[PDB]
Amino acid sequence: TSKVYDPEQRKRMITGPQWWARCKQMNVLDSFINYYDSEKHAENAVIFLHGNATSSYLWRHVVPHIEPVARCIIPDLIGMGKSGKSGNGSYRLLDHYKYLTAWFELLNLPKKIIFVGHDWGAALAFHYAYEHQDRIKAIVHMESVVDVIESWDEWPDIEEDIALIKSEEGEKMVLENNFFVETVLPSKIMRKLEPEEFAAYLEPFKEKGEVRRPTLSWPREIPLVKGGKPDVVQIVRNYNAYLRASDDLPKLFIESDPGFFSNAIVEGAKKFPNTEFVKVKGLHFLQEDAPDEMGKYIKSFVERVLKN
Amino acid sequence: TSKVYDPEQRKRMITGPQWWARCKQMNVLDSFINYYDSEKHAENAVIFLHGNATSSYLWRHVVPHIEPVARCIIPDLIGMGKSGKSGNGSYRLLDHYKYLTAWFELLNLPKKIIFVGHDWGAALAFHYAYEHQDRIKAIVHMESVVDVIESWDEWPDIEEDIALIKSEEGEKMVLENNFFVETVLPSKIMRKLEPEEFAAYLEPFKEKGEVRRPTLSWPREIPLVKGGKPDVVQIVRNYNAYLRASDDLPKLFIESDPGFFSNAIVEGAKKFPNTEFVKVKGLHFLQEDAPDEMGKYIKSFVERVLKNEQSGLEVL
Amino acid sequence: MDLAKLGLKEVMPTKINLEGLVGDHAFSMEGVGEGNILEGTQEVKISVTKGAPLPFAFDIVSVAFNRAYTGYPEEISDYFLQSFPEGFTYERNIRYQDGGTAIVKSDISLEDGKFIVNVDFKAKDLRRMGPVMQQDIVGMQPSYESMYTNVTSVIGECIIAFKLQTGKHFTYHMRTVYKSKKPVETMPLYHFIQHRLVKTNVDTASGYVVQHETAIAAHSTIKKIEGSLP
Amino acid sequence: DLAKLGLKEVMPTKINLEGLVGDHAFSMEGVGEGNILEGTQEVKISVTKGAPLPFAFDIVSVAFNRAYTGYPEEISDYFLQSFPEGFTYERNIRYQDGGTAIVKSDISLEDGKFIVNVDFKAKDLRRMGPVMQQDIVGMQPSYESMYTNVTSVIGECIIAFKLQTGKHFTYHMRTVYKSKKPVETMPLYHFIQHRLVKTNVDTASGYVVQHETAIAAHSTIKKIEGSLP
């Protein structure tokens, strides 16, 4: 594509180095989770879950706004970011779930957490919350895996490309050509990333081989009723129905404008009770295009849930 | 352009020679008028006045309908048709009118004439109408010089062409290339004329030169309030005013559809009272794509007008 | 440069069988003629057979009178040819600049030697004073129809330009969805298809037009400043 | 011979623009130069207000002067002979979306260089559509048929945007090239070919450069001598 810099950006550009430096690691099963921690206000934790192609870096300019009211923890999911690779080299949805819940127990969380999810990130934080219902203070989602995919309608024209990666082409689409990081990632940001912000997202997957397999295998779990991995369909089916019942649990949805998936999913969002809705600048990686509004919208939401 | 023959027309085709053999002649001033005469039911006269590029032949299939209620008489205007040439060799509106009013006396008309005009021949019926208010029973018109022309708006894309013709290239356009007979005239007819029908129209102006002048100086009579000849604009203005008041006078407007000029003039025609409007499918030479329809329309109109031996004629 | 293996002997005519509806007038015309495969030249004898004669300029049903007759170079693939065997069609939308619209629904096929067509012209909302009902139209000038893949079918899009009698021009916007009903090997990338459709020579003649459509596929000859996109 | 008009072959066209897609006022620009029977012109299009802009960039790339076009002198050049004063177009663009844009520009002359001044206002662009979705690679080449109409030549052209999925998204463009000097020999009818292609390719940018070629021609088929038309 094309794209111009937001010029107001470089005054405050947090490069990859000056993100990772501010992270702490911890051992988890046969490997580890590099992750960020506000540390301070720890009587609440708000956990941030990036999705495919990205990393905990994707929440950098979002996370400060809400640091002053609760502890925020932003992992890299396994195989992504400076987090360490997976034991078996498999990276399906539950893999990510394995290494992530395991990591949870290591954090001395409150027993009432707030999850903030994006992309497949939201899927983790939904399928956790289904299985840990007593311990969700609130949920925040965006560009989310809300429910299963039957009708491609309000959806971006991304079929056939899905067939092209659930195909055996996808190996040489993604391992060989780093398709999601190099082609898809900047494509779906409004502004152009300063050449070092891109350098961040790229570095984890800077080289050919199965080291890219997370970016290939996340979308091969697309919950399509016809042709999608049955277990994933069953997982999203299950946390939807509960989500659909989650009357007691405060929610907040953030559609992006235009959006990418937001358009098609937003109907499904308000099939979940207790959702405060809001709207912000942009495409799919909305954190690149409206972090500060995203910021203070999540802040004022948490403030509400913390008033009873 | 393209155009295809009417399949069932050639069966009843009337060639030029077959028409002319049915025409009469009389001397008129310094020349003569070829013309066509129903003759019977002469208690009435319905005069049909063709216009530019045509001749009485224009009416050949229209007239058979009107003949059995009123005498029909259908001139060739001067220097056109098989009529005689004009004395001065000129052919403007009034030249056509002098020769035409002369021929109206040598014919034993009733007092109140019925007129059927088309194109300029309706301007001839409109002029005579203004100076003869007591000799007129009804006017049928079509594609007609209604009113003056203020702007080229709802008008066909023929500005430029007009000014191009009021210019020493109208000589070369008309005299040498027979512009209005060989192009403009089958151009403005839906069906394709049979070769011999076109041969009628072409027979006058077949030769290059001054035998083509009426087809050139007729559009050069066009009433543009800007740039048009002032005496012509004063004529039509005068009969337009008289025609707008002519409540007395029953009229019939046959709109052509698309038509050529019909679109730009339907509203002017509407400014004439006691007008019954009708509609037939054609271009400018409506007669050549629907004379049986015009035929019966004019018929029921004259039959209805001719009960002037009692009440009015447009209840209510 | 194969041929006999496709149902096609290079030598091949056409027989069109149109039926129509402009504004209000239900006509029914008909075509007979031929051209050839690889140089892609063609010409056919169109002839009204119901609703003669036409209230509208004839020249608007002439894009309705096949892209089998297209000259394809080696470097670009030929959807229409590769198509048959048996089932291939189009759906075509005209908007005349005066505001009138037109819809066209074929069905080509192969019998003996070659093609049959069932066309279905249908226009509406042309203006009285418009070049079509005023039969001003001398004919269409040439133009290049863009051609581009969309999945199971090809989209074509040209701006066709009627030469009016006054020397000026009347343009319309046409757009075509060619969909062959047997799935077929290769689908071309994106390219141009250039026509010049002319009418033969009919003087005053008998009542038939005959036109000579010939169209050859090509690629923008200003070749690309290699370091660029797309 | 191209003295006459007060214009040298190569020439620097500073190309200020003013834009509004939808909700968004943006005040771009473009600095360049090019040639005139080459047909070739390059511009460093900078975006200079409303960064970031919320829509695929290429919709405003045709907004960035047919002074630049190979007119073989067997087909007269409307635009060259509108100078020294210059000329104006009004462009009407209709995307297959249904979305539309009008392009209003004046191509004056002010210190020996082509001061153009483009204006561009679009809307009815659909959210899920390839302009809000920023899926446009770039413009394919195009063929803009030209014809005379009184003191004007209108251009009509079908542009195709190539998309990331290989599919295309096309639009239809009608342009009112009205001179302002009265110009003799108006042209017959012909097409101008373009390949417009972007070429500062993969940069740290801050700006996009495109290079448009522009040639007038006729055909490679030609008539049966019978003609008509």
Ligand SMILES: O=C(Cc1ccc(O)cc1)Nc1ncc(-c2ccc(O)cc2)nc1Cc1ccccc1
């Ligand atoms: O697989 C997923 C996750 C997902 C999220 C929400 C949802 O409703 C369904 C699935 N997403 C996905 N699924 C498919 C595509 C995709 C497919 C083809 C293409 O050309 C562009 C994007 N993109 C993405 C997300 C993404 C990743 C990286 C960069 C941008 C966007």
Ligand SMILES: O=C(Cc1ccc(O)cc1)Nc1ncc(-c2ccc(O)cc2)nc1Cc1ccccc1
């Ligand atoms: O001048 C006239 C007479 C006229 C009638 C009604 C009216 O409102 C105004 C004038 N007609 C005329 N005046 C001009 C033109 C004309 C000029 C150029 C052109 O391309 C097409 C028609 N046509 C015509 C009609 C015509 C006459 C002869 C042969 C064919 C058609």
